[PDB]
Amino acid sequence: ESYHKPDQQKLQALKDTANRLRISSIQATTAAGSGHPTSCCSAAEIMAVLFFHTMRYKSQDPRNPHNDRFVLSKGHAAPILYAVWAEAGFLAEAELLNLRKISSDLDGHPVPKQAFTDVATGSLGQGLGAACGMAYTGKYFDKASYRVYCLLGDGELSEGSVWEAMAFASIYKLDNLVAILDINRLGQSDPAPLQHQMDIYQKRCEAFGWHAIIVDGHSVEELCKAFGQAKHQPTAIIAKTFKGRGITGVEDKESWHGKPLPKNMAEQIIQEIYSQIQSKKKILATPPQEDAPSVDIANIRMPSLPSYKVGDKIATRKAYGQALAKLGHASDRIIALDGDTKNSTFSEIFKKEHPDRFIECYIAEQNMVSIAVGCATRNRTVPFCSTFAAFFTRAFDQIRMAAISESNINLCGSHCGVSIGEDGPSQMALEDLAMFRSVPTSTVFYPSDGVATEKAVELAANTKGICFIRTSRPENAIIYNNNEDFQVGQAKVVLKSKDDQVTVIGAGVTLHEALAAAELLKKEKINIRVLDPFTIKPLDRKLILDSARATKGRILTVEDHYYEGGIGEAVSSAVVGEPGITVTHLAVNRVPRSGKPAELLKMFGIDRDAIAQAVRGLIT
Amino acid sequence: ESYHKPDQQKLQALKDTANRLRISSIQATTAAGSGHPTSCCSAAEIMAVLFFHTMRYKSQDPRNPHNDRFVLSKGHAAPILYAVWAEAGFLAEAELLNLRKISSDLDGHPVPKQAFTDVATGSLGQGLGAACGMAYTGKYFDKASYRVYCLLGDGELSEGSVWEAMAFASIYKLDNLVAILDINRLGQSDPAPLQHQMDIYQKRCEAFGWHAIIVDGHSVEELCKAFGQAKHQPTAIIAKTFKGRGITGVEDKESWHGKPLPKNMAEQIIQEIYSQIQSKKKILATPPQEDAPSVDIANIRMPSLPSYKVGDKIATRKAYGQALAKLGHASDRIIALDGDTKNSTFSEIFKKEHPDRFIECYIAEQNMVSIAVGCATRNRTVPFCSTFAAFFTRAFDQIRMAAISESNINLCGSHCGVSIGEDGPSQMALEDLAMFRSVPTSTVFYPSDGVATEKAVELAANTKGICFIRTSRPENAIIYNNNEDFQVGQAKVVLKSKDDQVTVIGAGVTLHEALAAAELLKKEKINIRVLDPFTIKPLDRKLILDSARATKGRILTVEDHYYEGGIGEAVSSAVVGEPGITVTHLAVNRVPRSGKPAELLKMFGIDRDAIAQAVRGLIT
Numbered sequence A, B: 001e002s003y004h005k006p007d008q009q010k011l012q013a014l015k016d017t018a019n020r021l022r023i024s025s026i027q028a029t030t031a032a033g034s035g036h037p038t039s040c041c042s043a044a045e046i047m048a049v050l051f052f053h054t055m056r057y058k059s060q061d062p063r064n065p066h067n068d069r070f071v072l073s074k075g076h077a078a079p080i081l082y083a084v085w086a087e088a089g090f091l092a093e094a095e096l097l098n099l100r101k102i103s104s105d106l107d108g109h110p111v112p113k114q115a116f117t118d119v120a121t122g123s124l125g126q127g128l129g130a131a132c133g134m135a136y137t138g139k140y141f142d143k144a145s146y147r148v149y150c151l152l153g154d155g156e157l158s159e160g161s162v163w164e165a166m167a168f169a170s171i172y173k174l175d176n177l178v179a180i181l182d183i184n185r186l187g188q189s190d191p192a193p194l195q196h197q198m199d200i201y202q203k204r205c206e207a208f209g210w211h212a213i214i215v216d217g218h219s220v221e222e223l224c225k226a227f228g229q230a231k232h233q234p235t236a237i238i239a240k241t242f243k244g245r246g247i248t249g250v251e252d253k254e255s256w257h258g259k260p261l262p263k264n265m266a267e268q269i270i271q272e273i274y275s276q277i278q279s280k281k282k283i284l285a286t287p288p289q290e291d292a293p294s295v296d297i298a299n300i301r302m303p304s305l306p307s308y309k310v311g312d313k314i315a316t317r318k319a320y321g322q323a324l325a326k327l328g329h330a331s332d333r334i335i336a337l338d339g340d341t342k343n344s345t346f347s348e349i350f351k352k353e354h355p356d357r358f359i360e361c362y363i364a365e366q367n368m369v370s371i372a373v374g375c376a377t378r379n380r381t382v383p384f385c386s387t388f389a390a391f392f393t394r395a396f397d398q399i400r401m402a403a404i405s406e407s408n409i410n411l412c413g414s415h416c417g418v419s420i421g422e423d424g425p426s427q428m429a430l431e432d433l434a435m436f437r438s439v440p441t442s443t444v445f446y447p448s449d450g451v452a453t454e455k456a457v458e459l460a461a462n463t464k465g466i467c468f469i470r471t472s473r474p475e476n477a478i479i480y481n482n483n484e485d486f487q488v489g490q491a492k493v494v495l496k497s498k499d500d501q502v503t504v505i506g507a508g509v510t511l512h513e514a515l516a517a518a519e520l521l522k523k524e525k526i527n528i529r530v531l532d533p534f535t536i537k538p539l540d541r542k543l544i545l546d547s548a549r550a551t552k553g554r555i556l557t558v559e560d561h562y563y564e565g566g567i568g569e570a571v572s573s574a575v576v577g578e579p580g581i582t583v584t585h586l587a588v589n590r591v592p593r594s595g596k597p598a599e600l601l602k603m604f605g606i607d608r609d610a611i612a613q614a615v616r617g618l619i620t
């Protein structure tokens, strides 16, 4: 479809639109008493041209799967996003004045309770990665005509996550993706490092494989032309702008970031801007080509029960890869992402079987999470991203923002705990339960054998929110029958007798250490109840307390994790104040070191001998 | 001091050294049964030339403050680091064979229990940032002649944190810093994206402001010359290498990352390598110019007591900046870092008073933490880095690694909780207590007024480990006298009577909400004990239980944080099983939204009215 080269009246209408967007941005933030009108004003021509010349979308159905996508990476410009959706006819004009009120959904930064928002972007530097996932999905999965546009600030470009996304887009030839850089010279508290050195921005973009075009970001003409032209590779529109453009006395000045205009000033400036608008008539949005496919919303089921054998030995990391590949045969919705760790997480098994649905993300965990979030938007795919659980700490802000984005992504982190052995602490996840439990939409699976792992993968696929599966490096015995039923929030009692002295709660390697402790203790005529949580969040409080009441009130938790935020604290918080109930904890008390897995479990006090000693001390 | 242009015999000795380093790397990893000899072998000429031609250091005193610094960013090449320190005479040869044993300190990745290691680097992409802090310190603080050298992998370059460091180094003109890029074509599980496209690496480095030199990384001559030449700006030595160089049959092959050679193969390959060594005589290290200044190790004390007034209103974020500036007058060791948030965290006050000791880190939280870690190495400075607590989640892996690095850094995160109001959840720290409590070397301060904030800054300065100070946006009343004594692990009872019904534990805004609840409740003839923890980690368990025993065993915790990993869970874990003790929690149960601070405290159930209702329900 041809570029429509605008006439001078269309160009004037785009200028008028940009100026209306400035006025609203000022009105809304002055009404709120907070916000970022100067950050809106540098972007006003960009927004007018994108929404009212370049992009194709259903104005009354912002989530429509055929629409071009727009990602406001510089999310503090939210008031101008809201203004463009009022200009397009989706939002009521009057509602814009309710910015940041508890009575409104026009919140301080964009969030997906808004139909026109797919991802929340208030934490800078994350929007381009989500946009990359949207574009990858458009080109390779949906195979549709929609384009993806992402608006970034210049200060924002200091975030490394942006450059991971830059590199991803050129690796994967995302010629349907456009990044618009609002080079307004200034960040929050000082000039951005490169200021108006447009040539260095261009060199950086080009060095990372993008087609880079420098424009006057306040020229509607130049913007129409640069956006109109497609682009064989990801394209960066490097827009020279002025912060506070159009606000006399404030344009290009420090000390105005995140500062609203006082009422008296807003009124004077708005009259100035208004004087430059030549018509009140609004431009209409133009709709998309409807070529996005249907996607299935049904439950995704494993094609058969697990086929392990009780007593065989397999690491849950390897069971994860097996289970994920298996599930990929049941549904084309499943996609897998990994950060150059596929041979260690065993996501390589999925790649072997389903290569078209595997995304190599390289050593770039931040971006990997953002790609997954973008792929999950509009329910287009069901992503599973993997790396070592320790390296998901590199992506915690992306995970945090994924929950604010109401995203349905699945994360599998391997190599938990000291039981990995010889690599040492840099590779050992000892804080991942703390991390993921603190994510408000999370479900935390900690499968203890291959059967439980397969069941966790299936359950995660069908569970909303941030699903985390903690996998382990040691081979451990299969303990569950293949037809054992598993559910979110349902634990399992894996050993019991009527004379049990203590309820021992373990998971992964420490479950197996607890079972081995039970055998040690049998020699002493001491029986212990052993409980496998299955999910750490939510925790089966009922079965834990029913168990504890059968074992003189006594609970011992043992975990390959630090003391804070893990299993022991979850249990303690669940049962505190319950009459007659006591909880004793065994966990890892400090940064570990290299050695054999069994040696480290011993050193850090979480192996079978440590468990047996704690049990005896409770009995006395 | 002149470049010493080596003769052919010195060059042959450097080749011999490189080959000895290969042999040891193989021997050690084969002995261990794990490790990364192919990653060592690509770097062997680089290591030989750096340690035995270019760098200047005391071989018997690796931590000496005058020494050049070397940072092994690609930390899985640890065996070749160990080998070079044995070659230099510091380590015993025989100890190299004890790699990864629980009986050795030659662990799988480098750690600072090793004298020759300043920062732990097992999580890729972090070493260059630490090296930047070392170089910044050398040039601007120590004003010394030492240089800083950092060896990176090519896959590693996919991490965004590397590019933040690249940009930092050119902003700050770190002409004493050299990055060596081991472009061996391969990552862990596939070729690195750019493979041997040396020109694109050069363009990326140059676009980020570095002087970039492409070399044959297996030519000792070319390396000597490129390292010899200083360099007016940060310099990237872009070394074309082959993974597994020198291992016949393995050089340049996939499927060998992190795979040790079997014994039979190691023996054959070592005989091959050994055959190419022309002399056993070792080269000696060359010592540094001793021009690093003395640094003071004494306690750092505030120059006076706090000068607040009880009843005056100040936000703890603003008290932080005031206190940090004050402390900077007492000692030149204090430095401040911030990520383009200085006007919102109030670190701008320190910048105003002590500009030479403020480091603007721009919107790049990962790198900021790494700069701080590097500045703290060898005790050269006492860093305080600040941003919003929510954005420290962007740096969790750097923080995690800082504890593995035994680093003494101070972090102040503002804008905690829903009480920030209108910006919404992207800015709200609701998981920072979970995060920082899980860091094993951490001390977590949560000051509730300006006095407590000043005391926390002073205590943090003098406390080892990862110190976190949680600051808040609302102005709240000063409640403490200026001469109130504060200590790590000591809480305060701020309201009590002999007829108290409940012990209410709050902090920051929720302390003030609890005090307001106490006034509400007085109307009903209900008294409550109110306790301010001061430190969340470590928690004053004794005062909490003594308090609870005075209030019928009843504890209510109220926090502007999610339920998991915060104050309520810390308290529950501390007191679980204590007879007669109950704990009830109020926290934030889901992702928040925009509104006024008081409105959000109400919506999320943590304001004075919520507290008063929970107290009444306990009494019944």
Ligand SMILES: Cc1ncc(C[n+]2c([C@](O)(CO)[C@@H](O)[C@H](O)[C@H](O)COP(=O)(O)O)sc(CCOP(=O)(O)OP(=O)(O)O)c2C)c(N)n1
Pocket (backbone or CB within 6 Å): A038, A039, A042, A074, A075, A076, A122, A123, A124, A125, A152, A153, A154, A155, A156, A157, A182, A184, A186, A187, A188, A192, A243, A257, A258, B339, B340, B341, B343, B344, B363, B391, B394, B423, B427, B473
């Ligand atoms: C990951 C990350 N780091 C730092 C920031 C902080 N930040 C921004 C805001 O958080 C808005 O999103 C900031 O304004 C706060 O709203 C404000 O500090 C609150 O102030 P208070 O009243 O004191 O509480 S925006 C920003 C600068 C971005 O510059 P840019 O990319 O050049 O964009 P421009 O605005 O010029 O177009 C910074 C540092 C965030 N959010 N994320």
Ligand SMILES: Cc1ncc(C[n+]2c([C@](O)(CO)[C@@H](O)[C@H](O)[C@H](O)COP(=O)(O)O)sc(CCOP(=O)(O)OP(=O)(O)O)c2C)c(N)n1
Pocket (backbone or CB within 6 Å): A339, A340, A341, A343, A344, A363, A391, A394, A423, A427, A473, B038, B039, B042, B074, B075, B076, B122, B123, B124, B125, B152, B153, B154, B155, B156, B157, B182, B184, B186, B187, B188, B192, B243, B257, B258
């Ligand atoms: C932040 C981050 N992300 C990913 C990785 C993983 N990783 C590396 C190791 O972790 C070593 O540090 C990895 O080998 C593990 O030791 C190994 O997977 C364990 O295997 P197991 O036996 O299955 O348990 S190293 C690496 C590739 C680096 O490539 P490069 O930069 O090009 O360096 P080169 O080796 O060629 O010189 C990856 C992905 C880490 N660590 N950090």
Ligand SMILES: [Mg+2]
Pocket (backbone or CB within 6 Å): A153, A154, A155, A182, A183, A184, A185, A186, A187, A192
């Ligand atoms: Mg800007």
Ligand SMILES: [Mg+2]
Pocket (backbone or CB within 6 Å): B153, B154, B155, B182, B183, B184, B185, B186, B187, B192
């Ligand atoms: Mg490599």
Ligand code: NA
Pocket (backbone or CB within 6 Å): A408, A409, A410, A459, A460, A461, A462, A463, A464, A465, A467
């Ligand atoms: Na899910």
Ligand code: NA
Pocket (backbone or CB within 6 Å): B408, B409, B410, B459, B460, B461, B462, B463, B464, B465, B467
């Ligand atoms: Na400290």
